[model samples]
Target: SGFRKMAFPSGKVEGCMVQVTCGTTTLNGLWLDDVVYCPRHVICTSEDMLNPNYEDLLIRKSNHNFLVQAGNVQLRVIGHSMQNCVLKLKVDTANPKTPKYKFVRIQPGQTFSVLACYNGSPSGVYQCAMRPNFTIKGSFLNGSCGSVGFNIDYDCVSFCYMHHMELPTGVHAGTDLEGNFYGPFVDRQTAQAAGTDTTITVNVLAWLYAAVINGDRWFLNRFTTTLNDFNLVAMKYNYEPLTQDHVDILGPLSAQTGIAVLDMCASLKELLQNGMNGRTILGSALLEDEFTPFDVVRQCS
Candidate 1:
């Protein structure tokens, strides 16, 4: 039915409150982002319709309805309509001829609640809109309207960009939209050539081995003494005396290493004093090999 359009005075239509709902549940005070309408002020709120900046945080739906970025599966309007006369809300109309809907009555300056929609994604952070069909009945006038809407702007990489690590002063760094901090190591090709750090480690180990054999007088004397002593025991056991040729074949003997060799001696001292009842320095097989200095040295390597 067509309503009689009445010429009401200015400020006669103040503002209305809108609250959202899901299913039969009511959710209130969500602070709606924006609201807009169509068919221009035939039956619309005076405040929100004129200004694009109006954010009432209310939820409503009608001929002159409201917009929200709530991202709810279903949304309903339940609140007050601050008008001079009766405000009729014919909600959830599929089309002009659809009869399967409900009507809500919002008396002037009082409150009313009505189900808006439960059939679609109305509004969200990824830009969506909802236009639930309905008609609004006001004082001497009515408008067939639905909500004109928008959603909050968002993208895939919106908040994914983040910084993982920070570098020292004057150091150059690279970053992407995903916020990964890249250093000089990020450019090194490990598939072909090794790093300089590997070369430095090789050089240091070589120097230390040379120091063990020639530079350290005490190590040379002890190495020879331990070898000779082990050879004496080996002779008693009918085993051959361990020679320098055997040491050469063993390559990097742990006995020729730096502090690790010292730890080996301390472990041997504890083992001999405590007997074979306990073994902690290395594995059990390696502990038995330690009975011979050459075998122990090979085990170390």
Candidate 2:
């Protein structure tokens, strides 16, 4: 039966960029940007859910086809849920030559962390922000790549959506709905309680990658997975559905944007001397519930 939903505590990853050689091309990034620390020590405290206005900061999924006007971009999204997607995205660049460009299109599964800066773009110093629409597409996310193992002996490992994604409802909460008064991302306890919860769990096996990539963290390899039967209340603390206004408020800020102009393939972490050898930034809650422990490996589905 659907009973187990494990959520890692929220924490922050702090450290410096550690550049290692993966091959001819060095593996300088953990997600899409750069890698500063490990997930073992980063303490992501409970806070409000990221605002929808800033949803544009993540990748996008749209509803209708849009057209880019002089320097202005358009977002034509469809086949996606309204909860996930960005609209009216404006991109700023350090280079003044290519300062203007509209978001004309998106790759089937790609969202804009930052759009290309077209020099001829309109407004003098306009920071690009995505517009919102009603759609069912998942926005771009940040995560690491990893594998997860389930206990087939008693837990019915095959029941997991990670095995086969034909079931959309399989990953949603039906009983335990919990979270911060605002949303699920803030606190794990509340997020786990929401009965209609769909957790995008992740598992680590060997050298895998998941998490989306931002300044230094990979910001795209994440997916959504749901908790079967468990209530949202059990998964999170002070949980509540996020409104569009919430996203807009927290989308762009000094820390949200990073210390400086964020680069898709750069580092946005605090510059430290050491790497993630002693740092801890992640955790698991799979065994804390009624069901047997299943190392859930997922992003959103």
Candidate 3:
């Protein structure tokens, strides 16, 4: 005659039965209640070389999987799993040095999704992969995609600074201009102290000319609005409103010489390129060939 005792962890018990009897001569097996089964890819019991139990119990590995999608200038990762597990994801853009990583736990039989940025560029490639570890089961499902993942294409409007210029494709233009301007002229006080009033007038001329020739009404509207804002701020700061003449230059200049607009466009392009370095616009690309602004304007005349 023999007996056995076993202690169970504290938890809800279901579908389990236990019994004890006196003068019990025969013993069959022991059953437990509310027992947590072993995870997949793990051996539940020792193997018998010669007398192996064909119906022996074993746990299966977690069926971890993932998918990626691109939407709204963001890369999205969707996770799926059959069992509770932790997984790590690595995402790399065109720049190998700058890689992004994320670790997440997927509940048993649960699916989840996450998002990432694509960074600023016309086009780029990305590589994504899942890391293998103890918590993870099954094989890694890795993939890659272009700037905008899947079969989609990138749209600048979603990420571009809309206050500058609107393109036919609906994306903002002059993003670099805005970035350069904000770099130095953070506020009205700073701009006024730096004596950028004259520079502001020229910048407005440059941008207005660029927008007019480009036929970007959105940009022109922004230019007008910015002028009004500048005037208000100047008035508040006791500075004279930044003003400019030659306002009729666009019409007269364009009508004077058929190539006048083209020359002005080139000059504006030069201004933009020069503005990139600093708020102080040095010289226009129009002078790159040793031509003067007067020459360019005279040609327009």
lDDT of 1 at 221: 26
Predicted structure 1: clash tally: 5
Cα lDDT tens digits, model 2, 162-201, are: 0000113222110000100112222122323223422221
lDDT, candidate 1, at 157 = 11
lDDT-wise, the better of 2 and 3 is: 3
Ranking by lDDT: 1, 3, 2
Q: What's the CA error at residue 60 for candidate 2, in Å?
A: 34
**Decoy 3 TM-score against native:** 0.17
**Per-residue lDDT tens digits of candidate 1, residues 78-137?**
333322111222233212221121122211111111111221122211111110111111
Q: Judged by lDDT, which candidate is best? A: 1
Over 134-174, each residue of candidate 3 has an lDDT whose tens digit, in order, gives 01111111110011111111211111110111222221111
Off by over 4 Å in 3: 1-198, 215-217, 222-230, 233-240, 244-301
Off by over 4 Å in 1: 1-226, 237-240, 254-256, 259-274, 285-301
Q: lDDT score, residue 223, model 1?
A: 25
Off by over 4 Å in 2: 1-110, 116-118, 121-226, 229-279, 282-301
